[PDB]
Amino acid sequence: VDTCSLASPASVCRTKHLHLRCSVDFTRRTLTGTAALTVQSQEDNLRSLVLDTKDLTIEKVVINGQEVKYALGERQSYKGSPMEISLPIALSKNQEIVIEISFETSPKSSALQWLTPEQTSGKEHPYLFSQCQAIHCRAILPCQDTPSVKLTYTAEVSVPKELVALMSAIRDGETPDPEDPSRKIYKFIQKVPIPCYLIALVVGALESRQIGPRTLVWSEKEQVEKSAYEFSETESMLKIAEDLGGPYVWGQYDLLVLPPSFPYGGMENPCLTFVTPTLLAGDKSLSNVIAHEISHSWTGNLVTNKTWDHFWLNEGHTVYLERHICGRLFGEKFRHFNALGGWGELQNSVKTFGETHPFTKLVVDLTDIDPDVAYSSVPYEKGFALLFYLEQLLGGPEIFLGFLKAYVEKFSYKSITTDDWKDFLYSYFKDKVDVLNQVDWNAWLYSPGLPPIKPNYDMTLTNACIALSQRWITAKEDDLNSFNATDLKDLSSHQLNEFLAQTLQRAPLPLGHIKRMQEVYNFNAINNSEIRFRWLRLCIQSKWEDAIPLALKMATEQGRMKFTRPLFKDLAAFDKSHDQAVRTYQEHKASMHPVTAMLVGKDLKVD
Numbered sequence: 154v155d156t157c158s159l160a161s162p163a164s165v166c167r168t169k170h171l172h173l174r175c176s177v178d179f180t181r182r183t184l185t186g187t188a189a190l191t192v193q194s195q196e197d198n199l200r201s202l203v204l205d206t207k208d209l210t211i212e213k214v215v216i217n218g219q220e221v222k223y224a225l226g227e228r229q230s231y232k233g234s235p236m237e238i239s240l241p242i243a244l245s246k247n248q249e250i251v252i253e254i255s256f257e258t259s260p261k262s263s264a265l266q267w268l269t270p271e272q273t274s275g276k277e278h279p280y281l282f283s284q285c286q287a288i289h290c291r292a293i294l295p296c297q298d299t300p301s302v303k304l305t306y307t308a309e310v311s312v313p314k315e316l317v318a319l320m321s322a323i324r325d326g327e328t329p330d331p332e333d334p335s336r337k338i339y340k341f342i343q344k345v346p347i348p349c350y351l352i353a354l355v356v357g358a359l360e361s362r363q364i365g366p367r368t369l370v371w372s373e374k375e376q377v378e379k380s381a382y383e384f385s386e387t388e389s390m391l392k393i394a395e396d397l398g399g400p401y402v403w404g405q406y407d408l409l410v411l412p413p414s415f416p417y418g419g420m421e422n423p424c425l426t427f428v429t430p431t432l433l434a435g436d437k438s439l440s441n442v443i444a445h446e447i448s449h450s451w452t453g454n455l456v457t458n459k460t461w462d463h464f465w466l467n468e469g470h471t472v473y474l475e476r477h478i479c480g481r482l483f484g485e486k487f488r489h490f491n492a493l494g495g496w497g498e499l500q501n502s503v504k505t506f507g508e509t510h511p512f513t514k515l516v517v518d519l520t521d522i523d524p525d526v527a528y529s530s531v532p533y534e535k536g537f538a539l540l541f542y543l544e545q546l547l548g549g550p551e552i553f554l555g556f557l558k559a560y561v562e563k564f565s566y567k568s569i570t571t572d573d574w575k576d577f578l579y580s581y582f583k584d585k586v587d588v589l590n591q592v593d594w595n596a597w598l599y600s601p602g603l604p605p606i607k608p609n610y611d612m613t614l615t616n617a618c619i620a621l622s623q624r625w626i627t628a629k630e631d632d633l634n635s636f637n638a639t640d641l642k643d644l645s646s647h648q649l650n651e652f653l654a655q656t657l658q659r660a661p662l663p664l665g666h667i668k669r670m671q672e673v674y675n676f677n678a679i680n681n682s683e684i685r686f687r688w689l690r691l692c693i694q695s696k697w698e699d700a701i702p703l704a705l706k707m708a709t710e711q712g713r714m715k716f717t718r719p720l721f722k723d724l725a726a727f728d729k730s731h732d733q734a735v736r737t738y739q740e741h742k743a744s745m746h747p748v749t750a751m752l753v754g755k756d757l758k759v760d
């Protein structure tokens with residue numbers, strides 16, 4: 154039972170295909186058109202069905218060329234409104250019909266951000282992008298908005314002719330719009346069955362540059378050169394992912410670099426990964442996000458979580474593959490450094506939520522919880538930690554990667570639960586069951602707080618970070634003179650970031666220490682978004698007023714929630730910046746991503 158969805162469940166009927174014909178109206182900020190769902194009955198004598206919707210305007214529903222009765226129920230907060238459609242003829246089991254729904258989205262659609270020309274790089278044209286995960290597809294089109302249903306799709310999208318439309322699908326040509334010569338129609342085909350959270354659309358003044366045999370990078374013109382360089386390791390990561398996961402089945406692997414308000418580091422939309430411009434560090438140092446999105450082509454997009462309660466299946470496995478891609482490229486000690494870092498991020502999450510908090514459980518009950526509110530690092534890092542613990546228990550990475558490949562093969566094109574995964578784990582490791590039975594499954598899967606066992610981590614690359622962090626924390630005023638730019642001499646950007654993460658775990662530090670750190674290391678000059686984020690958080694929590702405008706600026710000049718949410722929370726917790734923080738949020742709120750706006754509002758306790 155998918156408690157996040159109001160639609161008929163997969164046991165009643167299932168959508169097999171969506172054909173979408175729509176037009177993007179920037180003047181009204183609406184997407185208008187028809188969603189033709191090919192639906193298969195799973196029941197005898199089926200006479201109605203229910204779809205998810207959210208802030209959609211329904212004009213009509215047509216079946217067999219005639220209009221049919223439908224009714225919208227009362228809104229159920231973040232779940233939206235259920236739409237019940239009365240079928241004109243009862244359906245037998247396995248019978249398929251096509252239902253054509255004429256609809257229009259709201260400007261306030263939680264799936265969409267509409268940008269004015271001034272919010273873009275080029276300053277001449279507007280821009281639109283979608284983000285459906287978890288349960289925002291219903292805010293774009295009526296559908297069974299649950300990952301327990303997989304469908305193919307085709308789409309024809311009419312846009313002002315100076316703009317480009319792209320989707321999570323193979324591009325299938327473009328034509329002038331017969332109804333309107335100021336417009337172009339772009340066509341798309343997704344021939345691999347996907348859950349609807351993977352439907353994606355962007356419309357804007359986009360250019361592309363080829364960077365590999367199956368990869369173009371797309372962005373506005375002013376970011377193309379920088380993006381092509383930043384993501385140049387993409388093909389080599391794909392080749393490694395294919396070795397670990399099996400054949401890449403999606404055809405193309407393209408990258409789209411969004412405007413700064415994109416809410417996540419990346420989103421694994423099939424054929425067209427979406428990424429934040431905050432990855433453009435200039436030195437390829439944030440490419441683990443690409444490794445992660447690439448890995449989702451197997452874990453998540455091929456093997457899918459059946460409901461959002463099982464989100465850790467998606468993310469834990471993807472982080473686990475991500476870290477293998479990085480270990481292949483850069484070495485096993487580096488996989489261990491990243492793993493141990495992730496454990497630190499898990500410690501942070503548990504501390505933030507509280508060690509008994511239900512969102513710190515690996516499997517979470519989302520019954521009356523908005524998935525956006527429950528979202529955190531826990532499914533990523535507690536899920537990773539479980540798989541890394543199992544790897545070590547079961548004989549190492551080579552053996553556990555054998556299991557991962559077999560898992561992907563076993564459940565490809567399916568949607569599965571934690572019990573499905575556990576069952577196959579036990580099947581695959583039949584000869585190691587006594588080992589598997591040593592695992593505290595109930596604690597790992599269902600208990601809050603940190604895991605009951607911490608895996609073994611090589612420390613080679615982490616030692617220097619810990620050492621320097623500890624020097625700073627134990628330093629007294631008369632020790633500050635001994636610090637110098639040469640302390641950083643042999644540290645990579647990854648290690649600088651980890652040194653700050655370690656030091657942030659003990660914040661605040663005395664203000665004079667933070668001032669000295671700026672004096673000798675000039676962290677204010679670093680534009681790596683990961684480093685700059687942690688440094689500004691350290692400055693604000695240690696109450697350095699000078700850092701207030703820097704922090705306000707980073708919080709609002711991009712909108713990746715990983716950075717915007719904690720920065721606003723830190724600025725709000727600091728008495729000197731509290732008023733500016735809420736004022737700044739109030740000013741930017743209308744032009745923010747709708748989900749980001751909602752979450753920052755809740756964090757700030759404003760409205």
Ligand SMILES: O=C(c1ccncc1)c1ccc(F)cc1
Pocket residue numbers: 286287461462463464465515517519523524525526527528529531532
């Ligand atoms: O609801 C979740 C979630 C599921 C399980 N644990 C934590 C969060 C979620 C999943 C995807 C997403 F984009 C936002 C939220």
Ligand SMILES: [Yb+3]
Pocket residue numbers: 325
């Ligand atoms: Yb074609």
Ligand SMILES: [Yb+3]
Pocket residue numbers: 629631632
């Ligand atoms: Yb001293």
Ligand SMILES: [Zn+2]
Pocket residue numbers: 445449467468471
């Ligand atoms: Zn992911």
